């Protein structure tokens, strides 16, 4: 009963007392350290979709078994995604993300060292399933530090990282395993895919260590009623600004804050409570009062993922005949390309950071969304690699913003108390949506050009239909 007017009051606090901090410093020191932790899932990303199918032609397999691994590591990281979103409701934001980054470099480390295949693959699942975790947990956990004066373009900022660890991904397999050769096959070569599978390992290893230095979020600890240690990491944020922008004699005005009120046995039982939690926070996220948001989320993230990942497969496919067609009179293309176009995205980040809380979030997606979908059409027509490559510089350009305009949307639609646990679920649906689409656009492969792209087309217009329903959340305290 009253703890909605009790919440309502501590977001109102909150504001204000960020305000009296103001941006500076500390947000830029996080903005790197979970921007490595972005980067991480953009390495693995990378590895899944674009290495290990062209390693599968190196390692022995069999015919019915050649598709599996990336569905396994898909499935993990669905797992993942849903499982650490769920605790870091509980447990907190940074615990579950260091937690989840150990497990990920764990068995990151472990897989460079397996001799068989089936270890391998269980591995590199459980190194999917501790990485599923990092971005419903990065996004809120900076956006709780963030003051509703310029917290979207903030937030559109933190995209980046992302493309550069795909980028890393890209250039570190064309420098250390061209030919994509993955014999279980290094005996210290310096040139082998286990150097290259401990070198992706590198960007979550340096988050963990980078993140070990920062503070867990206060809004965490109020919603939990921890009231003085939540005192003391805003304390931290505000000496840190203001002796940052030499002004070191200014004192934290803040004087009270509102807030929120055998060993296996035990452990058993404190399972039990967690998973009860974590389970009450999931259905909670479809209440009367939150149904039909959740719904229309579900549906436009369902068609983003689908379009995107069954484009990542269509592409590559569509290159190589076209390049067969030409030649009818390697690890450097993928590079290049990734490469082209990283360059592209930037400007289109740039420009939806720079006008997210300018225009607003529902405009910048629903304008992306119709310049996806329209952009998305167009790569029927390509007629040469220079051209496929162009449009497909053009549709991630335009892509990018609605993905940040819905990544803002999404972390402001939901409160506090259950953020992590929706952006989890609707990640976890992203990557059932990734394994759809690739399955069924792999079934295309051998039929026909243009039958793809119209599919993509048309469920990113069904995207667009249901973004346009959403409500918009410019000028409002974080909930
Ligand atoms: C909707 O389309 C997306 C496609 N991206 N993409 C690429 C390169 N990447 C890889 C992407 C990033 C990550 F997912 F890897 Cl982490 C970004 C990018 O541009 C190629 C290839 F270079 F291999 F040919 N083919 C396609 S489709
Ligand atoms: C709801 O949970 C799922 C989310 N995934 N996701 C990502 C990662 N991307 C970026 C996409 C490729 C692009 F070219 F379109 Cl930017 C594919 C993808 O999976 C980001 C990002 F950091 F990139 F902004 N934001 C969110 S939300």
Redesign the pocket.
């Known amino acids: 009963a009253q703890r909605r007017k009790e919440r309502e009051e501590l977001a109102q606090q909150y504001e204000a007392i960020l305000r009296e901090c103001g941006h500076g410093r500390f947000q830029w020191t996080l903005y790197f350290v979970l921007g490595l932790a ?1 980067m991480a899932d953009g390495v693995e990303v990378f590895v899944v979709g674009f290495v290990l199918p062209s390693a599968e032609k190196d390692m022995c397999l069999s015919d019915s078994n050649k598709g599996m691994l990336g569905l396994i590591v898909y499935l993990g990281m669905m797992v993942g995604a849903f499982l650490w979103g769920g605790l870091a409701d509980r447990l907190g934001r940074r615990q579950c993300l260091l937690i989840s980054l150990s497990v990920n470099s764990v068995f990151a480390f472990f897989s460079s060292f397996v001799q068989g295949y089936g270890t391998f693959l269980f591995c590199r699942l459980l190194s999917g399933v501790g990485i599923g975790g990092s ?1 419903p947990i990065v996004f809120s956990y900076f956006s709780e530090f963030l003051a509703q004066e310029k917290r979207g373009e903030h937030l559109s900022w933190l ?1 980046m990282f ?1 493309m550069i660890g795909g980028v890393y991904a890209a250039a570190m397999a064309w420098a250390i395993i061209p030919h994509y050769g993955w014999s279980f096959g290094s005996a210290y070569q310096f040139h082998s895919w286990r150097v290259f599978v401990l070198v992706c390992a590198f960007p979550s290893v340096f988050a963990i260590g980078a993140l070990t230095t920062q503070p867990e979020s206060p809004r965490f600890f109020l919603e939990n009623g921890k009231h003085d240690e939540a005192w003391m990491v805003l304390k931290q944020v505000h000496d840190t600004n203001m002796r940052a922008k030499g002004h070191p004699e200014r004192v934290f005005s803040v004087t009270h804050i509102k807030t929120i009120h055998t060993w296996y046995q035990r452990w058993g039982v404190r399972a039990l409570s967690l998973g009860g939690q974590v389970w009450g926070n999931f259905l909670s996220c479809f209440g009367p009062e939150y149904r039909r948001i959740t719904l229309m989320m579900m549906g436009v ?1 369902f068609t983003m993922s689908f379009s ?1 990942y069954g484009l990542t497969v269509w592409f590559p496919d569509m290159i190589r005949h076209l390049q067969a067609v030409d030649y009818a009179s390697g690890a450097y293309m993928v590079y290049f390309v990734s490469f082209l176009g990283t360059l592209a ?1 930037l400007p289109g980040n740039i420009v939806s950071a720079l006008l997210m809380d300018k225009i607003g979030r529902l405009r910048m997606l629903a304008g992306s969304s119709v310049m996806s979908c329209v952009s998305c059409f167009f790569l029927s027509f390509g007629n040469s690699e220079s051209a496929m490559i162009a449009l497909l510089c053009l549709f ?1 350009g335009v ?2 913003a609605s ?2 305009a819905l ?1 803002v949307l ?1 972390v402001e639609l939901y409160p506090s108390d259950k953020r992590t646990t929706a952006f989890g679920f ?2 976890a649906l ?1 990557k059932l949506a990734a394994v759809l689409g690739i399955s069924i656009f792999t079934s295309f492969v051998g039929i026909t050009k243009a039958a793809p792209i119209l599919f993509a087309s048309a469920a990113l217009a069904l995207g667009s239909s249901l973004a346009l329903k959403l409500p918009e959340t410019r000028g409002q305290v974080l909930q």
Do not use: E, F, M
């Open positions: 972005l971005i995209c992302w993230w995107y995205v991630g892509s990018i993905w940040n990544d999404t609707l990640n992203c």
